[PDB]
Point group: D2
Chain length 366, copies 4
Amino acid sequence: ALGVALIGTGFMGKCHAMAWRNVATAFGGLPPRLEVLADMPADKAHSLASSFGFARGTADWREAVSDPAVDVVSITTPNGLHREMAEAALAAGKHVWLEKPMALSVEDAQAMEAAARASDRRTIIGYNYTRSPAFRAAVDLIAEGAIGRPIHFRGMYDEDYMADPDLPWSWALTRKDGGLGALGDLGCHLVSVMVSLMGPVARVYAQADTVITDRPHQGGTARVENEDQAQALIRFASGTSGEFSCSRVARGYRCRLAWEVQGTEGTLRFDQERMNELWLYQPGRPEIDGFRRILTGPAQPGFAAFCPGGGHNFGFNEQKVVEAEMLRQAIAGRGKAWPDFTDGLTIERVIHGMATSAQTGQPVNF
Amino acid sequence: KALGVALIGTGFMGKCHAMAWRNVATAFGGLPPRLEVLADMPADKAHSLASSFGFARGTADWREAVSDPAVDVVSITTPNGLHREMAEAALAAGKHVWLEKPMALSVEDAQAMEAAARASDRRTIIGYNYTRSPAFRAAVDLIAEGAIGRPIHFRGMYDEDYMADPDLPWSWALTRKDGGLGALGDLGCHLVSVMVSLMGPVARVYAQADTVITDRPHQGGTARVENEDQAQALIRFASGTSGEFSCSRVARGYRCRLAWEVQGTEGTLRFDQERMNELWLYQPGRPEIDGFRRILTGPAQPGFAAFCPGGGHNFGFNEQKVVEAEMLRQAIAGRGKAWPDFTDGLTIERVIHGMATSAQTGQPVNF
Amino acid sequence: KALGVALIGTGFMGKCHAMAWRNVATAFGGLPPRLEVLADMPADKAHSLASSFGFARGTADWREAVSDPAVDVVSITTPNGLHREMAEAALAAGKHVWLEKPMALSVEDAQAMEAAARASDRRTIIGYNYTRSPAFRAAVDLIAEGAIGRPIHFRGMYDEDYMADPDLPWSWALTRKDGGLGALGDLGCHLVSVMVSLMGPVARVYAQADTVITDRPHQGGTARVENEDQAQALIRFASGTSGEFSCSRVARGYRCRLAWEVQGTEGTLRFDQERMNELWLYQPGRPEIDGFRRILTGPAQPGFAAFCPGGGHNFGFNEQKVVEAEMLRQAIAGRGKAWPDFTDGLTIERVIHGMATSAQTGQPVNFL
Amino acid sequence: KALGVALIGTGFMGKCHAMAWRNVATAFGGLPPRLEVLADMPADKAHSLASSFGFARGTADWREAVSDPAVDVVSITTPNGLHREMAEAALAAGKHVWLEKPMALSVEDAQAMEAAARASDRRTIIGYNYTRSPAFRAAVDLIAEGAIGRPIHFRGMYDEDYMADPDLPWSWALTRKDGGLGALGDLGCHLVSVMVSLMGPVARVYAQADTVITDRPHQGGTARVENEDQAQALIRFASGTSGEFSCSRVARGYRCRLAWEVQGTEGTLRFDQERMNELWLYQPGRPEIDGFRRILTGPAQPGFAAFCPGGGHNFGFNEQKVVEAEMLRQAIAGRGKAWPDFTDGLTIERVIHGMATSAQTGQPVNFL
C-alpha cells in the first residue's frame, strides 16, 4: 500500500484527495494509505485531514515530505512553491505528483528535471485533460490509422475567469511572481494534448495581447503584465502544420479546450465542455456519409473501471483518478507515466517559446 | 459517531455506492463514514472487493452485514427480487437504508416495505440518481422561481439499447414473476422520479407497450420474454397539466438518453442526461437576440461547488451518487428530509405499475 | 407547350408558390411554366403582385382565373375556408390543382372534394412541403432499403410559439366554426404527412388536447379560444407498430420544430426541421467507432443536385416548394405520381379530426 | 424600367445567378429583370439552358452578351482565367458587372480591372455569397450596436474536402498560371470577405501553407499540384486587434465549413455556414441563467422577411444570391452602395495574395 502525503487542501488538493481515495475502488489492488495532509493555517490542515481521511494534518509541509510512512507526494500548492516542494520531496526519496506548472521559469524546471533523474523516483505533471477516455481513445484511433496521416492540428483553450475588468490586480498578473498569463493557466494544457496527438513542436510564430491592462489595486490601478490571450502557428517535428490559441478573457467559455486533428483518411474533433463526445469522420458511402458522435463508454480506455454501461458521463474529477492510477502503476514499474519532469520541461520550453515569439515578433525554433 | 456502512452487492450500483460512501466526507466535509461490511457472493469476491473498496471485511452472508453492530446504514444494490427481503431485514435490525430502485417487483411488496419503514423509525432513500445532477436541481429551482411561468406540458423519454441485440440471452429478470416490469422497471421508474419532481404527482396515465424481442437464447434453446421492451404513456398531473412519457431498452444508438422538456407560459426548459452538464432555458427576449440559452453546469447550480469551484468542469454520473449519499447522511443526522423515502417511493411504484396495467387492458388508470 | 399557371392568393404561401413556379424549370430543366393569371383582393394588390411575381395579368375575380383557357394548373393559397369552393371550381374547369393544406375545415367537405377529384381525372397535390426536403426523402429511402431494419417505434412533434403570448389578440381562426382545428390543423396535419410517409397508415389514436390561454383581447374586452393550443396522441399503425405524436402553437422558443424519429430493429433515424439539412442515422458498428452519424444534406439525397452540385450548401424551406412544383409537373406529364392527392389527403384529414374527437371524448378512435 | 440581364457561364455559380435573377423581384418587389442573353460553350448547351433558365436567347459568343443594347448588367461566372477580359469588355460597353470571385488570378489583373471600374461610372459587385446570410448581416449589426463591446479576437476557418481524394485527377486549376491560388483562392477569399466585414481592414498577415497531395493522375501519368491544399495565418487588423485564419480543400468530413467567431470585451458571436440559420451570442448574464443564446434565423434578421414571414423556416444557400442580386439592383438604381465593388474587391485580392507571399517568404506582409 502506497503511503501518501498531500500538500495543499485547495480545490486541486481536494481533487487529488478524491482521486487517492477511490483509485483502488476503481482499478483494484490495495487502497493507498492517506498518511499526512499539509496546509495553513494549522487548524485548517487538521479540519480537512479529518474529512479527507488523512491519518494526521500538519502546517509543516517539509515534515510531511520527509515522513518515512510516505512514498509519494501530491503537490497542489501555489505555482511559486512548486520547484521548492518538488525538489525537497525528490531529495527525501519520494515520488512526485506535481500540479502544473513545474515552475514559473524554464531555468527552475530544468533544475527540477536534473533533480528528478538524479533521484530515480517517479514524477508526473497534473495534465488531467490527457486522462479522459475520449482523449485516450483519440490517441489509440490515430495509432491504428483511423484518420491516416495527420496533416493539420487546430486547438484552442478559451475560458472567461479574467473577462470581468473589475476583478482585482494580483501578484499572479506580474511576470516575476506569476510568470505566464493565459499561456501558463491554459496554454500548457493545450500543449500537453497537442504534442500527445501530433508529436513534438519544431517551431512557433506567436502573437499575444493584454486586453485588460489595468485592474483595481488598493484604492487605485495596478498594471497587468502578462497576456490575456495568445495565438500561434505551429510546425511539428513531423513537418505537419498547427494552429494554437488560449484566452482567459473569452466571454461565455468556462473550460473550452477544443482540438481537431485533420488526417489524410479522416478527422477527429473534441471539446472538453462536452468531454463525453469524440467526433470521428472517415470516408463512407455517399448515402450515409458523415461525422460519427462517439459517446464515451467502456470501449474507451479507463471508463470500464468507473461504469460498465456507456453514456453514463465520465467527469473532470475522474480524470484525476486515472492520473493517480497511472502514477501507482509507474511506481510499481507496471507502466511508464506521462509526462515526467523530462517530458514536462519540453512543454515548459514550448509555452515560454510562444511568449518569446509574441514579445520579439520572430519565430522560435526548438 | 462516524456513520457505519454496510454494502450489499458490488455490480453497477454496488461499486457506485462504494465510490459515493468513500468520498462523501471529502466532498461535503464532516466525518468520513466507516466502511464496515461488504456482502457479495462468492466469499472470495466479497473478500477481494472488500480489500480494494476499503471495507473492514467482506462476507458471503448479507444477513451478517445487515446485523453487524458497527453498521448504522445499509446500501442494497442486489437484484430487484431480493430488495423487499433485504430492506425489511435491515429496518428490523434498526438500520437506515439506501435501496437501489426499484422498491420491489410488485406494489404489494412496496406496500409492505412502506409500512415497515414507517414502523422502524429509520431513514430510507431510493437510489433515483438522475434527480441529483446540478442541472436537474437547477431546473426544479428555476420552475419554482417562475423562470418558465406556468408549466403547460411535459415531454419525457428514457431510451437505452442494452437489450437491442436479439442474441442477448434470456434471464429470470425477463419473466413477470421473477423479473417484474421490463423497460418500465429499469428505465420508466427513473423517468417518473424526474417527472413528478418537475410536474408534481400523476393523476392519470393511458399507456401502450410492446415486447419487440419475444424469445431469446436460453442454454442452446429459447425462452419467452414476458415483460415490455418499450412503453409510451399520456399523462395528466394532479395540476391538470398534460404530459408525454416513454422508455425503451431497444432504442438503438442511445446509451443513457433520459431526456425531458417542461414547456411553460413564460419559457421552456430542456435536458438530455447524455449531455448531463447542459440545461436549455428559453425565455422571451427582444427579437434581435431571442433564443434558447445553453446553461453550462457550474458552481451556480446545487451540489456542483462541493466537487469543483469553476464552471464547465463536467460533473460526472458517479458524482450524482456522492450527492445522494450526502442527502441520506444529512437526513440520518436529522438535518433535512431525503427524497424519495419508502412513502414517496411507493407512489412511483404505483405510477409505473399503473402504466403496465393500462398497456395490458387498453384502459386509462387513475391515482 | 409550357404548363399554364394560375395562382390564387398573394400572401406568404402564395409568394412561396410563385417563387417555386418561377425556378422549377431553372432547377429541373424542361419549359418554364407560363405565369398567366394571379388572383387576390383588392384588385390593386393583385395587379401590383402580378407585375413583381412575373404573372401576365392580375384580377380580383379568381373564378375568371381558374376558367382561363390559357390555364392548365391552379395554385390555391387562400384562407382555409375557401379551399373546398376554389378546388371544386378548378376541377370543374378541368384544371389540375396544387392545394395548400387543409383540403377543408370538415372531413365531410374533404370527402366531397375527394369524389370531385376522382370525377375530374385531373392531378391533385396537397402542399405538405415538409415531405420534400432532401433529408426527409433520404430517410424514406433508407427505411425502404432496410438501413434501420423494421420500424418498432415512431416519436414525432411539431412545436411553434406563434400563439404563446397571452397578449396576442383573438381572431376567427380560434373559433371551431370559422377556424376549425387549432394546433392539430396548423401543425398536426404536417406531422401526419411526415409520420404516415415513414410508418404507413394510422390504424388507431388515443389523444389529449388543451387550450392553455382560454381568452384573448378583443375590442377592449375578451373572447373565448375554442380550439386546442396543443395536443398529444399515442398511435398504433396498420403495421401494428407504436407511435408518439404531438403538436403545439404555444411551445415557447420553438419556431418550426417539426422533429421526428423512427426507431428500428437495426438502427435509428432522427430529424429536426429547424436544422432541415441534418439527418441523424444510427446503425450498429464496432465499439471503438460506434455512434450516430450526422448526414449533412448534399447531392446524394433526392432533389438536392437540381439546386447545387456541392454538399453542405444548405437547402432552404422555399426550395421544398420548388421540389413540390416539379413533382406535380411530372405527374401532370404522366412520368411520376404526386403525393398526396385528394384521396391520400382525405386520410390525413380523417386522422387529425379523429385525434380531435379522441381528445373530446376521452376514448380511442379506430380508422380501419 | 426592367433591368436587362446577360449571364456568362451556367455551372455552379452560373445557375445560382440564374435562380437569383429569376426571383429577385418576386422576393423584393419592383419589375422582374429581363433575362436577355445566356452565353456558354458549346452553342447547343447555351441554347437548352437559355430555354430552361428563361433567357430570351443563348449564344457561344460571350461578346454578344456584353454588347447587346437590351443588356444593362452582366453576371460573369466562368473560369476565373477570362474574368479580366470579360469584365473589362462589359465595362467598356457601358454595362454594370456582377463578377463571381475571384476578380482575376493575379493582383496585377485585379488592379487593371479596378482602374477600368473607376473610369466606367457603372456599378460593380464581387459575388461573396457568405456575406448575404440573414445570420451574418445580423452579426454585423449586433457588433455595430455594441452588443459584444469592443472586438478583441477573430478566429475563422473555411474547411472543405472536395480535393481530399488523392485519385482526383490533375487540372489547369492546380497550376499557378492557369489556376492562381489554391485553397486561399477558392475558400480564403470568402473567409476574408466575412472577416474584414466583421473586424474592419487587415494591417498584417503571417501565414504558412501546405500541399498535402503534391501530384495527381494526368492522363496515364501524373502532374504536380502547384498551389496550396491548406493555409493558416495570424492577423493584425488596422484596429490593432488579433485574428486566426485558415482554409483547406482537403479537410475530410467538411463540405461548407466557413466558421467564424468574434470575441469582444462584452460578449462573443459564433457562426458555422453548415448551420447557416444559427448565430450564437454570449453576453454577460445572471449566474443562474448565464450562457450562449441560439438565435434561429427569422424575420428580425436582414433580408429574411423578403423570403418568409415566420422564423425558423431555414433560409437556403441559394437565397443568399437573391439578396446579392437585390443589393446590385438597388445600387444600379442609386438607392444604396453594393459591397464589395472592384475597389473593395482589390483589397481582398491583396490580402489573400499577401498570405500566399508570407507563406513562401516566411516574412509577415503589411498592408497600408
